[PDB]
Design a protein around this ligand. Structure first.
Ligand SMILES: Cc1cc2nc3c(=O)[nH]c(=O)nc-3n(C[C@H](O)[C@H](O)[C@H](O)COP(=O)(O)OP(=O)(O)OC[C@H]3O[C@@H](n4cnc5c(N)ncnc54)[C@H](O)[C@@H]3O)c2cc1C
Ligand SMILES: N=C(N)NCCCC(=N)C(=O)O
Length: 381
């Protein structure tokens, strides 16, 4: 009994306009009619607008590291017209041993160097020369990755979305998917003003991917959102920290990175929570500040900005890009974890190829990627 618009037909309906839906929709959009349906009034209000904006190859599981490595070519040299300014800025990563665990530090160095030949093993004096506010008594050595980079996440995200629109795709905000049903050979999504139909439903809903499966009657993956908080604060007068690396502790208890002229700090937490519009917890912020004040000479007066976002994982820590088994046309783009920005070019290209029933592109295959390592089928026996 309430009015709705006539249904809109497409080739691929993408639920979510964060980095996952935008990157997949970007690579799909040259080949068919893309409609992206986004709940919020803006596409980057959840995790894609809440990241540390960093590119690190030696981070995550082996699948993650291959996706990240395979994305660099796009980030460094995107197609003409994709964006106005470079997407990456140099920002080496220094992982410091604050707990005196030389065996772990060596393991991470050897692991990282296999992927990144320029990775170096530093002694405590070398680490303190690079970030001179470090307390020498608290430092036992470090790894150093000269190839790390900061990512202009908004430019990247907006570039993917603009690419969709230039290929006649639609990016619809204020279009929460409220109902999902397989009807007459298509997935049909009801939004509050009308419905959308396509043979392929791309589930790119971030921490809400299992909620979308629940609307559709598709068995979920077991995704676990995890809260991570972060904050921005002013450096003390006299500290020029503009060119410091990303600094991370060896056990990921905190990190610290310059952000323009300010400092970004985080307790690097992973507290399991339900999908929601997550806010920072005071204990998170106080913990991150305490650990930075213990590891360095910095004193932190009060933050200028605080926030938290969701990093969402499946059991094995790897990303998911693949059709659901036994649910025709339902494609997962999920479990981006702490890595969705830095893996987005490879994940968007791979996911679009697989949605289209195409082989993965050579350059992705050359990085040690294949369909089965991306598939949700691996989460079951
Ligand atoms: C503190 C922090 C630091 C991080 N550091 C980094 C980093 O340095 N590098 C990196 O690569 N990653 C980092 N990450 C991880 C990165 O933020 C995420 O992996 C990535 O943003 C996930 O993107 P997504 O598109 O899956 O999710 P989201 O950006 O959350 O997008 C999902 C979208 O789905 C929409 N949606 C949900 N339900 C519906 C519905 N019913 N209908 C329509 N739309 C719906 C949501 O509104 C949302 O816009 C960090 C994250 C945090 C929080
Ligand atoms: N770069 C590292 N080796 N470790 C910490 C990365 C932090 C990250 N990208 C996250 O907040 O998801």
């Amino acid at each position: 009994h309430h009015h709705h618009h006539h249904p809109i037909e497409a080739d691929y309906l993408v639920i979510g306009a964060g980095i996952a839906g935008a990157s997949t929709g970007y690579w799909l959009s040259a080949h068919g009619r893309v409609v992206v349906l986004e709940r919020e009034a803006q596409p980057g209000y959840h995790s894609t607008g809440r990241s540390a904006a960093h590119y690190t190859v030696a981070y995550g599981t082996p699948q993650v590291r291959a996706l990240t490595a395979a994305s660099r070519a796009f980030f460094d040299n995107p197609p003409a017209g994709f964006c106005e300014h470079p997407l990456l800025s140099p920002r080496p990563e220094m992982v410091v041993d604050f707990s005196d665990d030389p065996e772990e530090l060596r393991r991470q160095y050897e692991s990282g160097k296999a992927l990144v030949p320029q990775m170096r093993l530093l002694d405590a004096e070398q680490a303190c020369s690079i970030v001179p506010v470090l307390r020498r008594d608290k430092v036992f050595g470090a790894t150093y990755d000269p190839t790390g980079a900061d990512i202009d996440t908004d430019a990247l995200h907006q570039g993917y979305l603009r690419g969709i629109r230039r290929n006649q795709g639609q990016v619809l905000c204020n279009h929460e998917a409220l109902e999902i049903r397989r009807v007459d050979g298509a997935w049909e999504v009801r939004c509050d003003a009308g419905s959308y139909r396509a043979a392929v439903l791309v589930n790119a809903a971030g921490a809400w991917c299992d909620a979308i499966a629940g609307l559709a009657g598709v068995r979920p993956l077991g995704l676990q959102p995890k809260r991570r908080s972060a904050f921005i604060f002013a450096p003390p007068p006299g500290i020029d920290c503009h060119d410091w690396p990303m600094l991370v502790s060896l056990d990921e208890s905190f990190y610290l990175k310059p952000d323009a002229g300010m400092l970004l700090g985080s307790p690097a937490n992973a507290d399991p929570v339900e999908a929601h519009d997550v806010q920072p917890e005071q204990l998170d912020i106080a913990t991150g500040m305490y650990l930075i004040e213990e590891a360095t000479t910095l004193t932190i007066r009060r933050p200028e900005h605080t926030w938290a976002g969701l990093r969402s994982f499946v059991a094995d820590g790897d990303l998911v890009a693949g059709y659901a088994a036994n649910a025709e046309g339902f494609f997962w783009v999920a479990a981006q974890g702490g890595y969705g920005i830095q893996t987005s070019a490879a994940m968007g290209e791979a996911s679009a190829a697989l949605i289209r029933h195409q082989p993965l592109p050579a350059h992705l295959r050359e990085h040690g990627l294949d369909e089965a390592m991306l598939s949700p089928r691996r989460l079951s026996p």
